[PDB]
Amino acid sequence: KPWWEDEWEVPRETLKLVERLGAGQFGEVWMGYYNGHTKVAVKSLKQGSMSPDAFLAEANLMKQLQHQRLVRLYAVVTQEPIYIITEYMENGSLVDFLKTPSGIKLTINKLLDMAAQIAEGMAFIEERNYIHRDLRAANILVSDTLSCKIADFGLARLIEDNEYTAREGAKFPIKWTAPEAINYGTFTIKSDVWSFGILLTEIVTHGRIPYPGMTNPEVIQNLERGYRMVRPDNCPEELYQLMRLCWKERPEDRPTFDYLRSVLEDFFTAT
Numbered sequence: 465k466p467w468w469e470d471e472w473e474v475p476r477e478t479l480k481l482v483e484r485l486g487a488g489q490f491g492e493v494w495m496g497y498y499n500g501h502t503k504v505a506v507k508s509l510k511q512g513s514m515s516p517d518a519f520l521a522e523a524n525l526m527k528q529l530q531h532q533r534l535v536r537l538y539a540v541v542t543q544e545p546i547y548i549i550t551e552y553m554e555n556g557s558l559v560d561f562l563k564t565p566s567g568i569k570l571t572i573n574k575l576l577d578m579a580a581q582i583a584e585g586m587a588f589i590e591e592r593n594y595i596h597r598d599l600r601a602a603n604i605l606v607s608d609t610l611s612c613k614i615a616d617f618g619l620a621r622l623i624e625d626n627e628y629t630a631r632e633g634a635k636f637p638i639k640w641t642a643p644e645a646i647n648y649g650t651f652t653i654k655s656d657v658w659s660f661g662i663l664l665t666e667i668v669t670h671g672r673i674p675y676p677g678m679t680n681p682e683v684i685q686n687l688e689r690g691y692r693m694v695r696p697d698n699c700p701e702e703l704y705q706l707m708r709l710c711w712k713e714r715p716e717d718r719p720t721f722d723y724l725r726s727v728l729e730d731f732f733t734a735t
């Protein structure tokens with residue numbers, strides 16, 4: 465729909481940018497208020513840094529994927545500077561939260577709880593025929609009540625025929641990304657499942673880099689031999705075995721997100 469009919473368009477006046485949370489090559493993220501009272505995140509596009517069609521694509525996808533476990537689109541401003549306004553996540557990114565005094569004190573039970581919440585989010589994404597492609601603790605946000613939500617949908621895609629194929633040039637974080645996606649550019653929900661296994665390591669290590677002490681080429685070498693990541697310090701063995709299922713060689717042997725959610729809730733209500 466055009467901007468004058470689009471239920472998501474808001475007048476820029478409705479928004480007050482209060483505290484900057486982040487700044488990079490392509491714009492900023494702010495905490496601010498919508499209509500004086502409602503706390504919001506505002507991502508702003510730095511003009512000329514990238515296409516506004518490309519920037520707005522993330523908001524259009526979020527219009528289609530609404531769930532409690534996914535950071536919610538609130539509104540767009542489609543005149544420069546372009547804004548995407550969402551649900552505010554008070555405790556910021558999981559990777560950062562896990563390192564704070566409150567993150568430090570969390571028991572394994574609460575960690576397993578948060579893991580289940582993330583799987584539940586991904587189970588919705590899976591049911592809807594989408595993939596995420598950027599699933600990692602940096603892209604999970606944490607609420608004031610310590611609930612978790614999937615964020616950063618920039619690489620997220622509605623799947624045609626189960627597989628998205630990126631361009632020959634395209635590069636992805638080696639430690640988080642499934643071998644078939646690094647090697648062939650082919651992504652499926654099963655690529656995300658692989659990423660989830662890596663994300664579980666970040667949870668149990670409070671946000672440490674996967675494959676401690678290893679370079680990208682070493683990770684690749686080890687994986688091809690049939691090794692997987694060494695058992696993180698203090699990782700319960702049941703969780704580690706659940707990671708290994710996410711890292712099955714054949715994407716099709718990897719579990720569903722519904723399965724992963726189910727098992728993690730069992731782990732949680734047992735601890």
Ligand SMILES: Clc1ccccc1Nc1ncc(-c2ccccc2)n2cncc12
Nearest residue numbers: 485486493505506507548550552553556
């Ligand atoms: Cl603003 C936006 C646009 C597109 C997709 C998700 C979000 N939501 C958020 N992104 C980033 C942060 C954020 C950015 C920097 C540091 C910590 C959190 N955030 C906090 N609450 C909601 C969001």
